[PDB]
User: Fold this.
Amino acid sequence: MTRRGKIVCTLGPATQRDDLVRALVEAGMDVARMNFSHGDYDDHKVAYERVRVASDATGRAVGVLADLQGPKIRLGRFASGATHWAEGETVRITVGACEGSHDRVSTTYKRLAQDAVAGDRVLVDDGKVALVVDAVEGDDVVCTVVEGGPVSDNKGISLPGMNVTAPALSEKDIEDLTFALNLGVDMVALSFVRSPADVELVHEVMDRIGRRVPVIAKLEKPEAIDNLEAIVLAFDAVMVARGDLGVELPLEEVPLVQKRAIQMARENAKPVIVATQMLDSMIENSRPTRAEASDVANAVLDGADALMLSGETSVGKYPLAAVRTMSRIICAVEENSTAAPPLTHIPRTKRGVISYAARDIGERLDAKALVAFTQSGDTVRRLARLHTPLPLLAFTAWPEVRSQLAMTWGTETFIVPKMQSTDGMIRQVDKSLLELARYKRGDLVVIVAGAPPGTVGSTNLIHVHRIGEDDV
Amino acid sequence: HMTRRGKIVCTLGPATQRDDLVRALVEAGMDVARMNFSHGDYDDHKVAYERVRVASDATGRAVGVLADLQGPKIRLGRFASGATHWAEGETVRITVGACEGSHDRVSTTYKRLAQDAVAGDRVLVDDGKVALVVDAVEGDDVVCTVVEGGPVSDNKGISLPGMNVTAPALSEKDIEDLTFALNLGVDMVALSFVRSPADVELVHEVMDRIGRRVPVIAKLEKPEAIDNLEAIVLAFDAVMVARGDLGVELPLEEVPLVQKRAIQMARENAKPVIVATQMLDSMIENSRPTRAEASDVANAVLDGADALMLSGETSVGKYPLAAVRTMSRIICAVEENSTAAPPLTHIPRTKRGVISYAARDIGERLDAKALVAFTQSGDTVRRLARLHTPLPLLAFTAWPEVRSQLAMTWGTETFIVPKMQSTDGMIRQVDKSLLELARYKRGDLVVIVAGAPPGTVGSTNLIHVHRIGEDDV
Amino acid sequence: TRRGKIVCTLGPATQRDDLVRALVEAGMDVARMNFSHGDYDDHKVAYERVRVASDATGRAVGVLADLQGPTAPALSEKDIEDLTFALNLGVDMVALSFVRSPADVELVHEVMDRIGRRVPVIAKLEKPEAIDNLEAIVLAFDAVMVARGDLGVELPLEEVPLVQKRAIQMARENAKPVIVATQMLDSMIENSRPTRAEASDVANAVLDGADALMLSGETSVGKYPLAAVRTMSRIICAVEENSTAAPPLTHIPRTKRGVISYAARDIGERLDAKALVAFTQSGDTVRRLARLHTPLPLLAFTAWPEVRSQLAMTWGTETFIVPKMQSTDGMIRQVDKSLLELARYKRGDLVVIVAGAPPGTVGSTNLIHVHRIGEDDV
Amino acid sequence: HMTRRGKIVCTLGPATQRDDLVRALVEAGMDVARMNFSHGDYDDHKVAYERVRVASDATGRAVGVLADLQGPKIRLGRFASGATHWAEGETVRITVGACEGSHDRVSTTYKRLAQDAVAGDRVLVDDGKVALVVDAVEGDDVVCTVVEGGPVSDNKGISLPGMNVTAPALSEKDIEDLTFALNLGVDMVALSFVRSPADVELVHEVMDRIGRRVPVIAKLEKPEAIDNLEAIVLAFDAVMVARGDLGVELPLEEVPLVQKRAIQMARENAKPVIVATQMLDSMIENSRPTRAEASDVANAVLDGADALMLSGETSVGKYPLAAVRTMSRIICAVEENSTAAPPLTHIPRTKRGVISYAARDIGERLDAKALVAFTQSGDTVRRLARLHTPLPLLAFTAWPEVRSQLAMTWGTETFIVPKMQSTDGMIRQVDKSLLELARYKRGDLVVIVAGAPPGTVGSTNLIHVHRIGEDDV
Assistant:
């Protein structure tokens, strides 16, 4: 009926101009990403509020997503500005301070010396240049260049295979998380996730400050894909970072890891975001490459809850066009086929059997919408992963949840009061839906909800009715 | 299956008039009591009727009361000697005039026989044991030739397959009996000799004149009924497969397929179906049935029948209790052995239908202890019963009459409750009613099917899964 | 024409001149010699009268020798004598009474292998211990006979109709033939017509899925032996001409032989074939198709005439004798030749043939071939 | 899946002319060699053609040869300066007359451009990198305005979306190239610029004049082709999805769905489908592909494609071997992971079709080591290939040409054998051929699909299941 798949946009320099955050929202932004690798806390505060004003003004829900940097592992500065590391040369990467020199340059990752051992590979600038550790002589990691090429200030370094010992949250991240939690963000994404235990360190900080939001694990490393199931269960959502996965994994394995992660997320009613290398050409162009449009469309077809724009909106010259184009692709894929990859988990539990039954009933009776009452989102997220073409309307008393459900597939959320009785809950649904030009009296709707209000049995009720069938 | 699901109808007569015998039936399993208005004066019925109601109250078991209307009385008159023998090839006269019976000439009770019969029509006597053929009508007399010979005696039944019979489906006598039964307070009425869907209208005329309707059961006795099977099942509220009678007027080998087809047809439309006659007739004189009879009963059960019926076995027999116990024991045995009954083919398309199927699925998938259905007329319960789900099926109704009417519906126990004021109060009532009987306890999972806000214009439209007393404190 | 098969018992009542032939003409498919009655000479004379009748009419007729049976061993001393006699006499099958265990067949096989001649052994389901081992017995024996009268002596009477259904099902799942016997038309021992209750009972055996039904005293000692067979036939036909199908089978085929039989039926039905043709050396391939109770005519072709008699008791199967086949292509040409000699089917009519790889191959059934009659006729 | 199923097409050019390089491709996995008639003179092709045939014989691997016809050459002429710059808002003239190139005015190779162009038509240049709009046709000059600016050089491609282009599908030059290729002995021909199902007839005219037909592959390059997708897939023998070209004339977001739709359409009709353009273009300059490219390839495989095609990657690139090795490695990885492919909706209705599906079922159910199909033209094997069954699929044919033609069909290896004399002999041949391979041994179960008696009128009509050498001595 409208766009189902959700769009995440990154905020940066390019979205600071007059009424531009609002222009994004109007073009379709559902979640706004605050990237804490860049900007001062003040730039974020001002972006954060511009989103909230835009969300109020337009009426559209917009979640706010705090992206934590994780371990900053990159080159230091060169005195020259740049150099060239040709094959066979010896080079020293040091955890000490030094001036940028062809033969010797610093790294930001202070533990590199203690972690590196003879043999470990060291990749630079998205794996464009590759080195190998010969030995650790004090603060210096002595390497040999295996694949040559140009190198400059502050290029990324990847250490596949190496037993890296940084925690998932740096000291700097804890400050950023704390800031974001107080600022009022709706979700937090953790980078460099390697184990299901990594969520605990985010939860420590949340419980100290006394405020928890959904935590999104970013799938960037092989160790993450090695624990894919345990991670999807321990976190609240996942983000497939294809660029980063492509650096450390076989390139041919990556398209299958994407599909597998998306499937895994849907089986467990967790949201999945697909990020990186989406429409990167639109950083410089008003239109994408054919290859990019195809790639995006396959993310949609793979079953993804949301797709994410990075530089396309954060630094690009065509931020609106990027969002409009992502929308137009998502729509086109959806308008063409209902079908998404089938799920294999058979529902066994009261809440699961009911979610499936509700969808069946709704589809079989040609309902105009599927209404789900929810206190945390769980009940709606269980319906969303089915990719039913029924509009999916969440009704909740907790307004935070409306923002959190911005990143979940096909879902619009309405904020309503706490319900006093089941019959009152039906009356509320009528009231809320009739306010919208979309619905009128006579339209068939399916409601999923709680026995007597605030019951010990959670979701346990399916109710089919036409709007205002009992009004006179 | 935790209990007997299939229901048992028993006929009341001479054999059930002595001391606390109606009660003995009920305790043995009788779910519906049949009052057969071809025998007894109105006083015998009044006394039986009340004995059933007292038994029902005493035991706590629901017992429906079924008024069987006679329809056209078509049989031989009396013979002066008491009997004769009509041997093959002989000419014989069956007359609408009064006469004393002789071999050559005997009267019939069916006064229109002369004007209805035509050259060629077959005239079958004594459950089709002897067959004649009309050569012509000379005045009073229908002049026949014997095709299959055998003995004939006073007042033996006559069946006229193929013949353009012109009696109405409701005789003058039936209208009196119907009127009596309606006022007496019976819960259902069965019409004999049904040939067309229109036949129900003549019963409805009488009901609406007296101002009281009950479910009307079409008895499938004639070929013309099976010719209109679908239109009849839709127009009536239930059907009864009368096997003996169908066996006389159709090829005997076609009957087992007609039974299956009628039962199927009834289940597709959420109408009850009763299977009657040729059940355990040997038990009129014997304490045990023939193997062939046990097989017959079991096949009715397997065919998908809501209820099975005893006739002479309880109404005139010498072993009425044993007959009911035996029918029960067979029904149980068939059920305890397989869940499976013939699949239904109607795909549900309507809100009420989709919900009934969904409720059953949910109930079975979650291993619910019972499936509870609220209902004003039975419709919602009957839609679940036809599925032959092994979940106990508990109807909740405000109308007490319905509890008696649901006595003939498969697998169903009914509870009578107050009018509900709110949906949440309705859930609380279900808990209260179930807990009264020390079968359900706190924690047992049940599925409820019911009405949006109480007295909603959308009838049944709600499915609700809960464990008993999960919210009490 | 009739699909379900009829077994008739021979006795005093069928010794009249050309009465056996009258049975065969009325429909007898299997002739039962009951070795609890008669001298060996009465059997010899009946045996030959059947064989002459079978030749004369052209109709296949199996001969089933019924060992009386007799805690007791499975085979009495007397049975061993009767079995030995019957085997040499040339019977096509043996039925064993009082079967209680799957091991019981071994004692019959000992005797067969001593004399050097094996035929199918039919276990008679007469006792509770048999029903307790129903599956193991159906597997060890080659066929089963449901004796309802006898089961009714020791079992709850109401349980018997469900045991009948269960045994018939069990037999069909394992491609064994099942006969339903006892209490069929016993009234016709004294009457020219049966009770309604009896006609209904027979029809229920048919509908339950039975390969064959059996007459006992009705033909062996009755006064209306022909009428009994004619009436059983007329009923079986009438039941068949109505009902479409038989109780579904649930056993999933997993073996080469089984997967092919199911596939052949599917292909046949999907393509609207007029017939299902089976080549067979031992019967197995035909028996696998018969148990399906497919409404397709089922035509068996065999070189071994003993097998044509043995297939007489399998459902819906007509069997023809042909020569030993020299090559697969020759075998297809034979099927065309034989089918045109029936002149039953027409120019473009499809049939499906199931057969053996190269003739006398170690893989038994392993070939499906769809062809039109006279398609390679230029 | 036991080996690579999806097939690889490689284009031959300058980069594949060096020492034993065609052979190195074949060894790396090339199944079809594309001869592109937009580059090279007839002598370069003759030498490539023979190098392929020698390589095919030497390695034992089947290698098809594919003649790609240019179709209408629609592009810029030459510039005197060599290149220019067309900036937005400027007026420029593209002329069908001869001239040397200036900024203001340059010639086109497409001589009909004047007669075809009308006010409003768009003119896209160099893969749509620059866009113009026609203001008028003033004689030989098509006077345009630049809508999207950018650099332009000698001999750049132009696309004319929407414009009623009037060139036939076969130029005069193409007919010469087709004729050459047919005599040379190529196994298939691909036609560019296909717009209608009638376009195949013009190729068939030429084939029938020369007296030799091969499969004709329609290249899906234009919107009009996708508008007739079904009629085209039926009239041609195969299709090639050219995504780059479709991307210039169609909405970019629609292209991924057109690819999927064409692949599906081809499989439903047992026609091969090749997916071409922009597969691993980065490997023209690099020893490894972009992640986006590997993903794209893998999605073509998953979409259901019979074959994937390399263009510049092998024809002009610096890593031609690595390109084919990499394409192989991706195809394998996708396949080793899931045997699932998009389901088909085609229900088989015909004797030959029902049998093909039944054979597959039987094979899969019995866990056969291979499915052997006898075929005169390929049709029988192509009907099994589109099912994407994980059974090895072994074609047996007496026509050697078919082995080359089946090189582009999914999952299919072909064996060339003598004409069969008898069905039993044909089974013996299957054993003989398979036993030569160390892959098969005595005892392996295989399913054979074939013809009744050899040279029967009833096409495919026989399924035979056997273990290799079960009757051996």
Remarks:
- Chain B touches chain A through 30 residues (CB under 8 Å).
- Chain B has 16 helices and 21 strands.
- The radius of gyration of chain B is 24 Å.
- The longest strand of chain B covers residues 130-138.
